[PDB]
C-alpha cells in the first residue's frame, strides 16, 4: 500500500507537471485532479479570456482535443520508454486544431533524447511550416 | 526604517495590492511544483522541497501565499489530538518530526528571514517576492466583524492554486476560512491566552504547541504589514483628517476592530490578562472559550505527553505574548494625530494606559508582575513600557497614599537631573516609602504594593539609563542626593524591619540600584 | 429556520430531557443552546422567541424584558423586531416594556405599538412649566378622545 | 524506525531543582543579557550545580552517559524505544548549559561542553521539543569553530550514520557542505574526487541493500554544490536509473518507492 | 473454509517467490563517468521487412529522437508498427494486428523475415564489448515450423536463438513492449483520444501507467486477507471449542 501510494503520487505528479508544461504552448494554465471517491480524473484549464479555471468539459472541441493530446503526452512521460510508436491522429482533430496538436507533439517530443518516437500519419508533414526544427526525421514513402 | 519597508524596486503595484511582485520562470515552476504536490496531499514532499534548499544556497525559494496558508493549517494539526490522522497520511515518518512541527518551523524561519532583509545573503527580488506572498497571506487572513458570542482569489494568473478546489487539508478547515468568521479570531486569542497559564495538560498542549507560536507569527506579520501600509499606502503630506481615515483602514485597525467589544479599555485589559493572578474587579462577565478545531481539549490515546514545563516558563511565555499584544495596540495608537481619534476603532491611548495600570496594580503575585516588566531588549519595547510603568506607579501611590503626586518621569527621562529631582520629591513625600497608615495585619499586602512600586521605579531607572547612560551619577550632586534619598528610604523600610512584624525582610531596591548605577552602594561597599 | 422543542423520553422517567433544534446558521449543527458555540444575537433571538412561545399558555397578564431590544448586529435584532410585530398583530397579547440603550437605524414601527421618547432638548421648555410636555412619547393625548 | 532513536536523556529530570534554578535565573541583581565572561552569574549556579555533570544529571542524563559522551552502536543506543521521561523546556536547558560555557578555560572543559551540546541537540525528545528558531543553538554553534564542531560531531557519531547527519542538517543546514568535506574529504579520498566518493558510497549502499541508510544519505547529499538540484545532472539520472532497476512495485521495501519519489522531486527542482 | 486457508498459503508462497526474485536481481549500470545532449543507445537505426504483409523487402532508417512516416493509409501503413512489435517481442492478442502470425506472412511465400538494428555505439549499451556497436534482432515466421529468432551481431555471429535474451535486452533498454500504450495502434489511439467521461480518462490513465494492475493485485490481496482474517477468527473459535472439549477430555 505504501509503495503503491508513493508510485501513484510520483506518476500523478509527473503527469500533472507534463500537462502543465504542455498547456503553456497555447498560453493556457491547466492542472489535473485525481479523485479516489469519484475514481475520476478532472482537468481544469484557464484560458486568456476567463479569470476562473473552468472544467475541461466546458470548452470548445479544439481545446478539448488539445487537452486530450496533452494528457496522452503526460501519460507517456511518467513511464520512461526508449521507443514509443503512434498511428495516425488526423481524423480526431480538424483543420487548425490538428496543426496545433502536431506542433505540440513535435515540440514536446523533439527535445527529449531518452525516447525515440515513431509517428505514422498520412498527412504530409512537409506542408506544415514547423519542419525547420532539428531532431525531426520525415520518411515519406515514394510509392503510394 | 529598514530595507523590509523601503524596498519597492521590483514591485508591480495593482488595485488589489501595492506590494504585488511578478513571478519569474524559475519561481513560476517552483510555485507550480508546490501546488501540484499539495494537490496530491503529499505535504511531506512539500516540506522536503522547502527544507532541502533552505540555507544551502545563495538564492531563496519563495513559499507561495496559498502554500503559506496550507502550512498555517498544518500547524493546527498537532500530534497530541491528530496522531492517527498524521500517521495515516505519512506511515513512513522519514523526517521523524510531526508535519505540524515542520510547518511551524518553516513558517518561523521564513518570518525570521523576512524580518531582516540581507541583500548580500539573498537577492532583493526573492526577498520582495517573499514579502508579497506573506502580505497576500495576511490580507487573506483579515478578521471578520467581531461577534460577542469571496471564497478564494488568486492574484497570479500564471498557475492554478491548489486552494481553489479544496477548503480542508486533513479534515481541518483552512486557517484563513476558520478565522474569517464573526466569532473565531477573538475566540482564538481568548482561548490561547486562557490556556497559556492552564495547568490542564490538553489545554496547555493546545496553546503552547500550536496557538502561541501562530499568534506570535501573526502579530509580527501584522506589524510588518502596518509598517508597509504607513510607509506607502498613505498620501505622505495630509490635512491630518484623511490620515486618521487611512489609519482606521490600517491592518492593525482591522486586527483590533475584532476586539472592540462595548468598552475597548476595560474589556481589552481583561482580555490581555485573562486567567491571570489579578482579582477580577466589578464581577466582570466570564468570557466564553471553545476549541477552534474539533477536539483541541482532548488527547488521543496513542500520544503520550512526556513534556513538563515549569510554571515560571509558562508565565514568562504568556506575559511575553501579552506584551507583544499590548505593544501592537500601542504601535497602532501612537500613529493617531493628537486631538483627533480613530473612527472605526473606539481606542484611546489614555484609557488603555489606565486599564493596563489598573490590571497590573491588582496583581497579587510579584512573579507575573516582574515577568511583564522585565524585557530582554529595552529598545524594542521603549514606546509603551515606560508609560505603563508610570501609570502603575501613579495608581499604586494613589491607593497607598491619600495624596496623589503627579508623575512627569516619562518626559523627565530626557534629563537625568529632572528625573532624580522628581524621585527625591516623591521619596520626601513618603509615597515611595512604606506607609505607616497600613496596619500590621495587612503588612503583606502593603509589601506586595511596595515591591510592585519598586519594580516600576526600577523599569523607569533602566529606561533613564538607556536614554542618558552613566556620565554624571556622582559628578552631578542631584543624582548623589537621589542615591542618599534612596538610602534614607531603605532606612525607613529598615525601621519596619526592626519592628519585627514578620521574619521576612521588606524588599529593598538599594542593592539593585547599586548594581545598575549605584556605583556599589556609593561609598558603603566601594571598598 | 426550522426548530422544535422536543422532549426526549428514555426508559427512565428522570432521564427525560429537552432538545432545541437550531437552523439559523447553516454552519452550526443542531445542538443544545449554548453561549460559547453560537453567536450572541442569534442566541438572544432564540431565547426571546422561546419566552414568547410560553406566554399564551401562562396566565401572567404581561411579560417584561430588560436589555432585550438593544441592537444585536442590526440583523438578528431586526428579525426579532419583525417577530415581536407579528406577535403584536394578534389581539389580546401581553405588553412588553422594551429597552433600547443603542438607537438602531431604520427601525420598523407597527401601527398597534407606539414609540415613547424620554429625551429632553435644550430648546424644549421645562416639562413641569409646559402643560403639554408632561406626557413623553405620546401622540393620542393631544387628539381629543 | 520512527519509535527507535538516540535518546541522550534516559531519566526523569529533577523538576524542583530545575524550577529553583529558573527562579534564580529569572530575577537577579544584573537582570541583563549574560556575557561570555564574569563567571556567567556563578554566585548561585555554583552553589546549586558546581559542575556541568551535575546539571546534566538534573536534566535527566545518567552519570554513566555523562562520563562517556559517545553513542554506543554495539549496545544499539542509537535505536531505542522512547523512555517517556519528562524533560525541562529546551530553552531553559540551553540557557543553563550556556551558563557553564567558561570560554576562559582549558580545552578539555570546552570540548566536554561541545560534546554535551552535540549529544543534547541530537536527542529525539529535544529535537521534537526544540523551538522553530534555534537562537540559543545558533549562538552555541557560533561560539565554537565550524570545523571543530564538525570534527567533534563526527567523533561522537558514526561516519555512515546518515540519519543523524540528516537530523543535524535539519538543525544546521549551513554546515552541510562542511559536513561533506569531513565525510568525502579530497585529501582522505586519495586522487578520487568528492563526487566519485559519493558515487562509490551510493554503490556500496545499493549493493548492501541498506535502503533506509541509502535514503537518508540521498536526503543529506542533495542541495550541496557536489549534488545540486537539476534535470540535466548525470548523477541524479544514474540514481533514478538504479532505483528503477531495483523497483518491482510488487514486493518491494517502502524505502525504494520513497527514494524514487524524492529523486524525481529533486530532479524537477531547478 | 479450508479453501480460504489454501488461498492464503498460496498467496504467501507467491509473495515469498516474488521477494526471492527481487533479491536475485542486481544493478546493471556501471556508471561510466564519460562527459546529456547526445541520445542514449538502444534506438532503432534501421528496419528491413522482407516478404512481410503486402510490401516486399523495404529498408527504413529511423531517426534518433522523432520520426514521421508519411506512408498513405491502405499501403501497409500499420505494417511497420506491427513488425516492430513482433520483432521486439509482444503477445499476438495484445498487438491486435492480423488474425494469426501465419496471416502476417506475405501470400504465396512460406517465410517472412523481420530485422531490427538497435544502436549500441552510444552510452547505456548492453554488453557493447560482446555485441559491438549494433545489435541485430532477426525474427523468421514460417507457415510450417515454429518461428525462429537470431540475436546476430554486425559480423552476423548469432549470439543467441532463445526468447529470454531478447526480453533481458529489452528490459535493459527499458522498452515497455508488454505495455500496449507505448505502441499505440489505430483502435487504441481512437479509444484513448475520444474519451469524454472523467471516469474513462482516469481508467485509461491508470491502465496506461500500469497502476490499474497493481491496484487490482492489491484489492485481490486485501480481499484474500479479509477472508483469511474471518476464517482465522472462525478457526480461533473452533480451536477454543476444541480446547474446551480437550480440557473436558483431560
Pairwise CA distance, residues C52 & C81, whole Å: 12
- Label residue D180 exposed, middle or buried (CB < 10 Å: 0-12, 13-18, 19+): buried
Q: Give residues preceding each break in chain C, C–N over 2.5 A.
A: none
CB-based contact D245 E29, cutoff 8 Å? yes
Kindly report the nearest CA distance between residue A30 and chain D, in angstroms.
Answer: 18
Helix axes B349-361, B443-468, angle to 10 degrees: 130
Cβ of B214: how many Cβ atoms within 10 Å?
19
**Cβ contacts of residue A12 below 8 Å, gap of 6+?**
A32, A34, B40
Do the Cβ atoms of D112 and D70 come closer than 8 Å? no
Cα E247 to chain centroid distance, Å, stands at 58
Do the Cβ atoms of B49 and B34 come closer than 8 Å? yes
Let me know the angle formed at the C-alpha of A98 by A95 and A104, rounded to the nearest 5 degrees.
145
Characterize the bridge pairing of strands A116-120 and A83-86. Answer: parallel
**Cβ contacts of residue E19 below 8 Å, gap of 6+?**
D251
- For B369-421, the three-class secondary structure string (H helix, E strand, C coil) is HHHHHCCCCCCCCCCCHHHHHHHHHHHHHHHHCCCCCCCCHHHHCCCHHHHHH
Is residue E77 part of an annotated ligand binding site? yes
**Cβ contacts of residue C60 below 8 Å, gap of 6+?**
C94
Pairwise CA distance, residues D92 & D120, whole Å: 13
Interface test with E, best of D194, D233, D245, D246 (most E CBs within 10 A): D245
CB-based contact B92 A2, cutoff 8 Å? yes
Q: Which three three-digit cell numbers place residue B104?
A: 511551524
B261: left (phi over 0), alpha (psi -120 to 50) or beta: left
D67: left (phi over 0), alpha (psi -120 to 50) or beta: alpha
Pairwise CA distance, residues B289 & B189, whole Å: 9
DSSP string, chain A: -HHHHHHHHHHHHHHHHHHHHHHGGGT-EEEEEEETTTTEEEEEEE-SS-SS-EETTSS-HHHHHHHHHHHHHHHHTTS--SEEEE---GGGS-THHHHHHHHHHHHHHHS-SS-EEEEE-SS-GGGSSTT-STTEEEE--S--
Q: List beta partners, residue E44.
A: E118
Nearest to D237 by CA among A96, E36, A16: E36
Pairwise CA distance, residues B281 & D171, whole Å: 47
Pairwise CA distance, residues B458 & B370, whole Å: 11
All residues of chain D having their beta carbon less than 8 Å from the beta carbon of residue B304 are 84
Query: In Å, how far are B115, C48, C70, D31, E170 from D28, measured between CA atoms?
Result: 31, 58, 53, 5, 77
Is residue E121 part of an annotated ligand binding site? no
All residues of chain E having their beta carbon less than 8 Å from the beta carbon of residue A11 are 209, 211
- For B292-330, the three-class secondary structure string (H helix, E strand, C coil) is CCCCCCCCCCCCCCCECCCHHHHHHHHHHHHHHHHHHHH
Pairwise CA distance, residues D98 & D94, whole Å: 6
CB-based contact D251 E19, cutoff 8 Å? yes
The approach used to solve this structure was cryo-EM
Alpha-helix residue ranges (DSSP H) falling in D224-253: 234-246
**Cβ contacts of residue B139 below 8 Å, gap of 6+?**
B17, B225
Q: Which three three-digit cell numbers place residue E155?
A: 559480423
Q: Which three three-digit cell numbers place residue B430?
A: 513618603
A9 HSE (CA, 13 A, CB side):
28
Characterize the bridge pairing of strands E66-69 and E111-119. Answer: unpaired
A24 touches chain D (CB under 8 A): no
Do the Cβ atoms of B184 and A54 come closer than 8 Å? no
Query: In Å, how far are A27, A89, A100, A118, E202 from A105, measured between CA atoms?
Result: 16, 11, 9, 11, 22
Of B54, B96, B108, the CB nearest to D173: B54
Helix axes E212-249, E2-24, angle to 10 degrees: 130
Of B36, B91, B165, the CB nearest to A16: B36
Pairwise CA distance, residues D155 & E211, whole Å: 47
Q: Which three three-digit cell numbers place residue B269?
A: 485589559
Judge B/A contact: 3 or more CB pairs < 8 A: yes
Do the Cβ atoms of E118 and E134 come closer than 8 Å? yes
Of D244, D249, D252, the CB nearest to A80: D244
Is residue E72 part of an annotated ligand binding site? yes
Cα B95 to chain centroid distance, Å, stands at 31
**Cβ contacts of residue B525 below 8 Å, gap of 6+?**
B514
Q: Which three three-digit cell numbers place residue E124?
A: 547505456
Q: Is B88 helix (H, G, I), strand (E, B) or coil?
A: helix
Pairwise CA distance, residues C81 & C96, whole Å: 12
Q: List beta partners, residue A120.
A: E69
**Cβ contacts of residue D10 below 8 Å, gap of 6+?**
D60, D61, D62, D65, D83, D85
Nearest to E139 by CA among E198, E72, E70, E51: E51
- Label residue D111 exposed, middle or buried (CB < 10 Å: 0-12, 13-18, 19+): middle
All residues of chain B having their beta carbon less than 8 Å from the beta carbon of residue A17 are 32-33, 36
Pairwise CA distance, residues B344 & B341, whole Å: 10
Residue of chain D with shortest Cα separation from A6? D257
Cα B366 to chain centroid distance, Å, stands at 20
DSSP B206: I
Query: In Å, how far are B310, D20, D59, E134 from D54, measured between CA atoms?
Result: 19, 14, 9, 74
Pairwise CA distance, residues D196 & B479, whole Å: 72
Kindly report the nearest CA distance between residue A4 and chain D, in angstroms.
Answer: 7
Pairwise CA distance, residues E86 & E70, whole Å: 21
Residue with cell 411579560: C63
Residues of chain D whose beta carbon is less than 8 angstroms from a beta carbon of chain A are 244, 249, 252-254, 256-258, 260-261, 264-265, 268
**Cβ contacts of residue D235 below 8 Å, gap of 6+?**
D195, D198, D199, D227
Q: List beta partners, residue C17.
A: C8
The pair phi, psi for residue C18, each rounded to 5°, is: -105, 130
Residues of chain A whose beta carbon is less than 8 angstroms from a beta carbon of chain B are 2, 9, 12-13, 16-17, 20, 29-31, 33-34, 44, 46, 51, 53
Nearest to B321 by CA among B220, B456, B187: B220
**Cβ contacts of residue E143 below 8 Å, gap of 6+?**
E102, E105, E110, E111
B92 touches chain A (CB under 8 A): yes
Q: List beta partners, residue C6.
A: C19
Nearest to C45 by CA among C1, C5, C76, C84: C76
Q: Which three three-digit cell numbers place residue B186?
A: 477573538
Judge C/E contact: 3 or more CB pairs < 8 A: no
Cβ of B210: how many Cβ atoms within 10 Å?
23
CB-based contact A9 D261, cutoff 8 Å? yes
For CA atoms A118, A119, A125, A131, give the dihedral sign: negative
Q: Give residues preceding each break in chain A, C–N over 2.5 A.
A: none
Is residue E178 part of an annotated ligand binding site? no
Query: In Å, how far are A43, A91, B355, D85, E192 from E196, measured between CA atoms?
Result: 11, 16, 67, 59, 9
Do the Cβ atoms of E167 and E177 come closer than 8 Å? no
Pairwise CA distance, residues B312 & E186, whole Å: 76
Q: Which chains, if any, share at least 3 CB pairs under 8 A with chain A?
A: B, D, E
For CA atoms E167, E171, E175, E178, give the dihedral sign: positive
Interface test with E, best of A71, A104, A141, A144 (most E CBs within 10 A): A141
B404 HSE (CA, 13 A, CB side):
10
Cα B464 to chain centroid distance, Å, stands at 23
Nearest to A130 by CA among D47, E68, D160, D75: E68
- For E227-246, the three-class secondary structure string (H helix, E strand, C coil) is HHHHHHHHHHHHHHHHHHHH
Q: Is C7 helix (H, G, I), strand (E, B) or coil?
A: strand
Q: Which three three-digit cell numbers place residue C143?
A: 387628539
Pairwise CA distance, residues D254 & D235, whole Å: 22
Sheet containing strand A116-120, edge to edge, reads: A136-139, E66-69, A116-120, A83-86, E183-184
Kindly report the nearest CA distance between residue B79 and chain D, in angstroms.
Answer: 11
Q: Is E97 helix (H, G, I), strand (E, B) or coil?
A: coil
Pairwise CA distance, residues E17 & D219, whole Å: 32
Q: Is B93 helix (H, G, I), strand (E, B) or coil?
A: coil
Nearest to D81 by CA among B99, B44, B306: B306
Characterize the bridge pairing of strands E183-184 and A83-86. Answer: parallel
Interface test with B, best of D3, D86, D132, D136 (most B CBs within 10 A): D132
For CA atoms B84, B88, B89, B93, give the dihedral sign: positive
Residue of chain B with shortest Cα separation from A35? B40
D25 HSE (CA, 13 A, CB side):
25
CB-based contact B36 A17, cutoff 8 Å? yes
Nearest to A18 by CA among D231, B377, E116: D231
Pairwise CA distance, residues D79 & D57, whole Å: 22
Is residue E129 part of an annotated ligand binding site? no
Q: Which three three-digit cell numbers place residue D93?
A: 536547558
Nearest to D32 by CA among A130, B512, B111, B237: B512
CB-based contact E25 D249, cutoff 8 Å? no
Nearest to D206 by CA among E29, B328, B432, B504: E29
Pairwise CA distance, residues D81 & D73, whole Å: 15
Q: Which three three-digit cell numbers place residue E165?
A: 535474451
All residues of chain E having their beta carbon less than 8 Å from the beta carbon of residue A68 are 192-193, 195
Cα B214 to chain centroid distance, Å, stands at 12
DSSP string, B251-270: HHHHHHHTT--SSHHHHHHH
Pairwise CA distance, residues A69 & A101, whole Å: 7
Chain E, 121 to 140: residues with Cβ < 8 Å from chain D are none
Pairwise CA distance, residues A72 & D193, whole Å: 42
b/e A42-76 (16+ beta carbons within 10 angstroms → b):
bbbbbbeeeeebeebeebeebbbbbbbbbbbbbbb
DSSP C126: P
Nearest to B163 by CA among B89, B70, B73, B100: B70
Of A2, A4, A17, the CB nearest to D268: A17
Is residue E111 part of an annotated ligand binding site? no
CB-based contact D254 A3, cutoff 8 Å? yes
Pairwise CA distance, residues B126 & B108, whole Å: 17
Residue with cell 486599564: B355
Do the Cβ atoms of B68 and B130 come closer than 8 Å? no
CB-based contact B91 A2, cutoff 8 Å? yes
Do the Cβ atoms of A82 and A95 come closer than 8 Å? no
Of B29, B56, B313, the CB nearest to D92: B313
Cβ of D141: how many Cβ atoms within 10 Å?
20
**Cβ contacts of residue B206 below 8 Å, gap of 6+?**
B78, B81, B191, B195, B291, B296, B297
Characterize the bridge pairing of strands E111-119 and E134-142. Answer: antiparallel
Characterize the bridge pairing of strands E111-119 and E44-50. Answer: antiparallel
Pairwise CA distance, residues E49 & B462, whole Å: 96
Q: Which three three-digit cell numbers place residue C4?
A: 422544535
Amino acid at each position: 500500500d505504501q509503495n503503491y501510494k508513493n508510485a501513484e503520487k510520483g506518476t500523478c505528479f509527473d503527469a500533472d507537471m507534463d500537462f502543465r508544461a504542455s498547456l503553456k504552448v497555447r498560453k493556457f494554465s491547466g492542472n489535473l485532479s485525481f479523485i479516489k471517491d469519484t475514481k475520476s480524473l478532472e482537468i481544469y484549464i484557464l484560458t486568456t479570456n476567463d479569470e476562473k479555471a473552468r472544467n475541461v468539459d466546458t470548452l470548445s472541441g479544439g481545446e478539448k482535443s488539445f487537452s486530450q493530446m496533452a494528457l496522452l503526452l503526460a501519460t507517456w512521460k511518467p513511464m520512461r520508454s526508449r521507443i514509443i510508436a503512434l498511428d495516425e491522429f488526423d481524423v480526431f482533430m480538424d483543420q487548425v486544431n490538428r496543426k496545433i496538436g502536431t506542433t505540440l507533439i513535435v515540440k514536446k517530443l523533439k527535445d527529449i533524447a531518452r525516447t525515440q518516437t515513431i509517428i505514422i500519419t498520412p498527412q504530409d508533414i512537409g506542408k506544415i511550416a514547423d519542419i525547420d526544427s532539428s531532431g525531426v526525421s520525415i520518411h515519406r514513402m515514394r510509392d503510394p | 526604517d529598514g530595507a523590509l519597508i523601503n524596498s519597492v524596486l521590483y514591485v508591480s503595484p495593482r488595485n488589489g495590492a501595492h506590494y504585488f511582485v511578478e513571478l519569474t520562470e524559475k519561481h513560476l515552476l517552483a510555485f507550480e511544483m508546490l501546488n501540484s504536490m499539495c494537490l496530491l496531499e503529499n505535504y511531506d514532499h512539500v516540506l522536503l522541497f522547502l527544507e532541502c534548499q533552505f540555507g544551502k544556497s545563495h538564492n531563496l525559494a519563495v513559499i507561495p501565499f496559498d502554500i503559506i496558508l496550507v502550512l498555517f493549517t498544518l500547524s493546527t494539526l498537532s500530534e497530541y489530538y491528530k496522531e492517527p490522522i498524521l500517521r495515516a497520511n505519512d506511515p513512513y515518518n522519514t523526517s521523524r518530526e510531526t508535519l505540524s512541527r515542520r510547518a511551524l518551523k518553516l513558517l518561523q524561519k521564513y518570518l525570521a528571514i523576512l524580518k531582516e532583509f540581507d541583500s548580500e545573503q539573498y537577492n532583493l527580488y526573492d526577498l520582495e517576492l517573499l514579502r508579497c506572498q506573506f502580505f497576500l497571506a495576511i490580507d487573506t487572513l483579515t478578521p471578520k466583524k467581531q461577534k460577542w458570542g469571496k471564497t478564494f482569489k488568486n492574484p497570479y494568473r500564471s498557475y492554478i492554486s491548489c486552494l481553489e478546489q479544496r477548503n480542508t487539508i486533513l479534515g481541518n478547515r483552512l486557517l484563513n476560512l476558520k478565522l474569517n468568521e464573526p466569532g473565531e479570531f477573538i475566540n482564538m486569542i481568548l482561548w490561547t491566552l486562557s490556556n497559556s497559564l492552564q495547568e490542564s495538560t490538553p489545554l496547555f498542549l493546545s496553546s503552547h504547541e500550536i496557538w502561541m507560536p501562530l499568534l506570535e507569527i501573526l502579530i509580527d506579520l501584522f506589524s510588518c504589514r502596518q509598517d508597509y501600509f504607513i510607509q506607502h499606502e498613505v498620501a505622505q503630506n495630509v490635512s491630518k483628517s484623511l490620515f486618521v481615515q487611512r489609519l482606521s483602514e490600517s491592518p492593525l485597525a482591522v486586527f483590533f476592530e475584532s476586539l472592540n467589544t462595548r468598552n475597548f479599555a476595560n474589556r481589552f485589559s481583561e482580555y490581555v490578562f485573562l486567567n491571570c493572578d489579578y482579582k477580577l474587579p466589578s464581577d466582570n462577565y466570564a468570557t466564553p472559550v471553545h476549541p477552534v478545531y474539533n477536539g483541541e481539549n482532548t488527547i488521543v490515546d496513542t500520544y503520550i505527553p512526556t513534556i513538563k514545563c515549569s510554571p515560571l516558563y509558562k508565565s514568562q511565555k504568556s506575559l511575553a505574548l501579552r506584551r507583544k499584544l499590548i505593544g501592537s495596540c500601542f504601535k497602532l495608537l501612537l500613529r493617531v494625530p493628537d486631538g483627533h481619534r480613530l473612527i472605526t476603532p473606539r481606542i484611546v491611548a489614555d484609557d488603555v494606559i489606565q486599564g493596563i495600570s489598573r490590571t497590573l496594580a491588582s496583581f497579587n503575585d510579584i512573579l507575573q508582575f516582574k515577568k511583564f516588566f522585565m524585557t530582554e531588549n529595552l529598545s524594542q519595547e521603549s514606546y509603551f513600557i515606560p508609560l505603563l510603568a508610570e501609570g502603575t506607579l501613579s495608581e499604586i501611590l494613589k491607593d497607598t497614599q491619600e495624596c496623589v503626586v503627579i508623575l512627569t518621569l516619562v518626559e523627565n527621562l530626557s534629563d537625568g537631573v529632572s528625573f532624580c529631582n522628581e524621585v527625591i520629591g516623591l521619596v520626601k513625600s513618603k509615597c515611595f516609602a512604606f506607609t505607616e497608615q497600613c496596619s500590621q495585619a495587612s503588612y503583606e499586602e502593603a509589601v506586595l504594593n511596595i515591591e510592585k512600586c519598586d519594580v516600576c521605579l526600577l523599569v523607569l531607572l533602566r529606561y533613564l539609563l538607556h536614554l542618558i547612560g552613566t556620565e554624571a551619577i556622582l559628578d552631578a550632586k542631584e543624582q548623589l542626593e537621589m542615591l542618599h534619598a534612596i538610602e534614607k528610604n531603605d532606612s525607613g523600610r529598615r525601621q519596619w524591619a526592626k519592628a519585627l512584624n514578620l521574619g521576612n525582610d521588606p524588599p529593598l531596591l538599594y542593592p539593585i540600584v547599586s548594581q545598575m548605577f549605584g556605583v556599589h552602594d556609593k561609598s558603603v561597599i566601594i571598598e | 429556520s426550522a426548530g422544535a422543542v422536543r422532549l426526549e423520553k428514555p426508559k427512565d422517567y428522570a432521564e427525560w430531557k429537552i432538545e432545541i433544534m437550531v437552523k439559523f446558521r447553516d454552519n452550526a449543527p443542531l445542538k443544545k443552546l449554548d453561549s460559547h458555540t453560537q453567536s450572541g444575537g442569534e442566541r438572544a433571538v432564540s431565547t426571546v422567541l422561546y419566552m414568547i412561545a410560553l406566554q399564551e399558555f401562562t396566565s401572567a397578564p404581561f411579560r417584561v424584558v430588560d436589555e432585550i431590544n438593544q441592537g444585536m448586529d442590526s440583523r438578528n435584532e431586526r428579525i426579532v423586531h419583525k417577530a415581536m410585530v407579528e406577535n403584536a398583530c394578534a389581539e389580546n397579547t401581553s405588553q412588553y416594556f422594551l429597552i433600547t440603550p443603542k438607537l438602531l437605524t431604520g427601525l420598523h414601527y407597527h401601527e398597534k405599538m407606539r414609540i415613547h421618547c424620554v429625551m429632553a432638548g435644550s430648546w424644549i421648555p421645562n416639562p413641569s412649566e409646559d402643560p403639554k410636555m408632561i406626557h413623553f412619547g405620546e401622540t393620542s393625548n393631544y387628539s381629543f378622545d | 524506525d520512527k519509535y527507535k532513536d538516540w535518546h541522550f536523556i534516559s531519566k526523569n529530570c529533577h523538576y524542583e531543582q530545575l524550577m529553583d534554578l529558573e527562579m534564580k535565573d529569572t530575577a537577579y541583581s544584573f537582570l541583563f543579557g549574560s556575557s561570555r565572561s564574569q563567571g556567567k552569574v556563578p554566585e548561585f549556579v555554583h552553589l546549586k550545580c558546581p559542575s556541568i555533570t551535575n546539571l546534566l544529571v538534573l536534566f535527566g542524563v545518567n552519570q554513566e552517559k555523562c562520563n562517556s559522551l559517545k553513542i554506543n552502536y554495539e549496545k544499539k543506543e542509537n535505536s531505542r524505544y522512547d523512555n517517556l521521561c519528562t524533560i525541562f523546556p529546551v530553552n531553559k536547558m540551553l540557557k543553563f548549559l550556556m551558563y557553564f560555557y567558561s570560554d576562559d578555560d582549558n580545552d578539555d572543559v570546552r570540548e566536554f561542553f561541545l560534546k554535551a551540546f552535540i549529544c543534547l541537540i541530537l536527542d529525539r525528545k529535544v529535537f521534537n521539543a526544540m523551538e522553530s528558531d534555534h537562537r540559543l543553538c545558533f549562538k552555541v554553534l557560533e561560539l565554537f569553530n565550524e570545523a571543530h564542531f564538525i570534527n567533534s560531531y563526527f567523533e561522537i557519531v558514526d561516519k555512515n550514520d546518515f540519519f543523524l547527519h540528516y537530523r543535524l542538517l535539519q538543525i544546521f543546514p549551513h554546515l552541510q557542505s562542511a559536513l561533506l568535506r569531513r565525510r568525502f574529504s579530497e585529501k582522505q579520498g586519495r586522487t578520487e574526487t568528492i563526487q566519485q566518493n559519493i558515487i562509490k558510497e551510493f554503490n556500496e549502499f545499493f549493493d548492501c541493500k541498506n535502503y533506509k541508510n541509502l535514503l537518508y544519505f540521498i536526503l543529506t547529499m542533495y542541495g550541496s554544490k557536489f549534488i545540486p538540484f537539476g534535470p540535466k545532472c548525470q548523477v541524479t539520472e544514474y540514481f533514478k536509473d538504479c532505483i528503477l532497476d531495483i523497483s518491482n512495485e510488487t514486493t518491494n521495501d517502502v524505502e525504494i518507492s520513497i527514494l524514487k519519489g524524492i529523486l524525481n522531486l529533486f530532479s524537477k527542482i531547478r | 473454509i479450508e479453501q480460504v486457508d489454501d488461498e492464503l498459503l498460496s498467496l504467501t508462497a507467491q509473495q515469498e517467490n516474488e521477494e526471492q526474485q527481487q533479491q536475485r536481481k542486481r544493478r546493471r549500470h556501471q556508471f561510466a563517468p564519460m562527459t546529456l545532449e547526445e541520445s542514449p543507445s538502444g534506438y532503432i537505426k534501421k528496419v528491413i521487412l522482407r516478404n512481410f504483409m503486402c510490401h516486399e523487402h523495404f529498408e527504413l532508417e529511423l531517426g534518433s529522437r522523432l520520426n514521421f512516416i508519411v506512408g498513405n493509409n491502405g499501403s501497409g501503413k500499420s505494417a511497420i508498427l506491427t513488425a516492430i512489435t513482433i520483432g521486439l517481442g509482444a503477445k499476438a492478442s495484445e498487438t491486435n494486428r492480423g488474425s494469426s502470425l501465419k496471416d502476417l506472412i506475405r501470400e504465396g511465400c512460406y517465410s517472412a523475415k523481420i530485422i531490427l538494428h538497435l544502436d549500441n555505439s552510444k552510452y547505456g549499451a548492453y554488453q557493447q564489448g560482446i555485441f559491438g556497436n549494433e545489435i541485430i534482432v532477426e525474427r523468421i515466421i514460417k507457415r510450417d515450423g515454429p518461428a525462429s529468432f537470431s540475436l546476430r551481431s554486425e559480423n552476423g555471429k548469432e549470439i543467441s536463438n532463445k526468447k529470454k535474451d531478447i526480453q533481458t535486452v529489452v528490459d535493459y533498454f527499458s522498452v515497455p513492449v508488454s505495455n500496449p500504450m507505448c505502441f499505440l495502434s489505430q483502435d487504441a489511439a481512437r479509444s484513448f483520444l475520444t474519451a469524454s467521461t472523467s471516469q474513462d480518462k482516469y481508467s485509461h490513465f491508470m491502465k496506461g501507467t500500469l497502476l490499474q494492475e497493481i491496484t487490482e493485485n492489491l484489492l485481490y490481496a486485501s480481499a484474500i486477507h479479509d477472508s483469511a482474517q474471518e476464517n482465522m477468527a472462525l478457526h480461533l473459535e473452533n480451536l477454543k471449542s476444541l480446547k474446551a472439549e480437550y480440557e473436558d477430555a483431560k
